[PDB]
Amino acid sequence: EHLHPLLHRNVSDLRGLRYLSRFSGDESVLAEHRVNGQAVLAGAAMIVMIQAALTDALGGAVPAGRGLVISDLSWRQPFSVDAANNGELFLELSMPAAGDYRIGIYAYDQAAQLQLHCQARASTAEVQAAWLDFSSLGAQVVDVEACYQRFAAMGIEYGAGHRRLLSLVRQGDQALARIALQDPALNSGFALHPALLDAAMQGVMALLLDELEERPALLLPAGLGQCVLLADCPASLQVQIRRAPSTAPDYCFDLALFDDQGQCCAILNQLSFQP
Missing domain, CATH: 3.10.129.120 (Thiol Ester Dehydrase; Chain A)
Known part of the structure; x- marks a missing residue:
């Protein structure tokens, strides 16, 4: 079964932890998000993929009243399903230092060239709530x-x-x-x-x-x-x-x-x- 609706398969090997999802283009995160007429993976979906990947790499759950923190994320090129990439989107997860995780999300183009679509770093932390501060008076x-x-x-x-x-x-x-x-x-x-x-x-x-x-x-x-x-x-x-x-x-x-x-x-x- 898929590990997660947006994180299908674990393809980790000696090069490091790695995950693979293959999309058809009919999925809502693509088909219901069209940019200039093309079904494009919503940027939000890549955040969810990072959250799913980290949760799996940590044993299936975040521990001990802590939060999953993703930091310094950048979106590069939009991702669309085509014959070149076969709908395949890879996520690489590394830990250059204890508790300091690095993520890259990429896919291959017609040229066999790897294309980086999203990059970020992650960690776990005790975090404090934001407070709903909204007064509608005069809104x-x-x-x-x-x-x-x-x-x-x-x-x-x-x-x-x-x-x-x-x-x-x-x-x-x-x-x-x-x-x-x-x-x-x-x-x-x-x-x-x-x-x-x-x-x-x-x-x-x-x-x-x-x-x-x-x-x-x-x-x-x-x-x-x-x-x-x-x-x-x-x-x-x-x-x-x-x-x-x-x-x-x-x-x-x-x-x-x-x-x-x-x-x-x-x-x-x-x-x-x-x-």
Whole structure:
């Protein structure tokens, strides 16, 4: 059986720990995430793959009230399934020093050249919750369809399984989003479902509708300072989003994911979007 819906097989050998997933292109993380008309693996899915790989390498579970921390992640080229790569996406995991893990996600092109798609470092730590800080007094209700229309105008179209933004409210440079899976049962087997993590990232558009023009340039996640996984995430979530300073021509945000009761389940610090 697959080790994880997004981490199919363990192919470790003397070169080191390594994992392999083969996608057909019909999977929701690809087919329901189309960029300029092509089914492309959502950046969130690679974060989930790192989390699954680390959890497996640690014996199948994170230990002792600690959190899985992914740091200094960068997305390079988008991944699409084609005849060249046969849908095969590899993840290499090394530990150059105790508790200091290095990850690379890559695939092969038509030229037999290895292409690096994602790179990050990981660790485990005791971590402290973010606090749901959002006061809606005076808040603005953001039209979710206006957000998806803006994404569509830049070239990003989502299928129903990844159109999980249910509501948005904006208060200054902060926004609060409600997201939930189309089929809650599909949360089975995921500590954090990629569609919910992707929907959390979609929420940043609440803060950009006024800044961006009708036909803005395509913006995609390019870097992430930290992704902290504190606890299993339910099928319904609240997402607090705060605009952060960024150098041009980029945009940066901090996000925190909470359950319907306000418990912090995951934190994303310094999520950078770039043309």
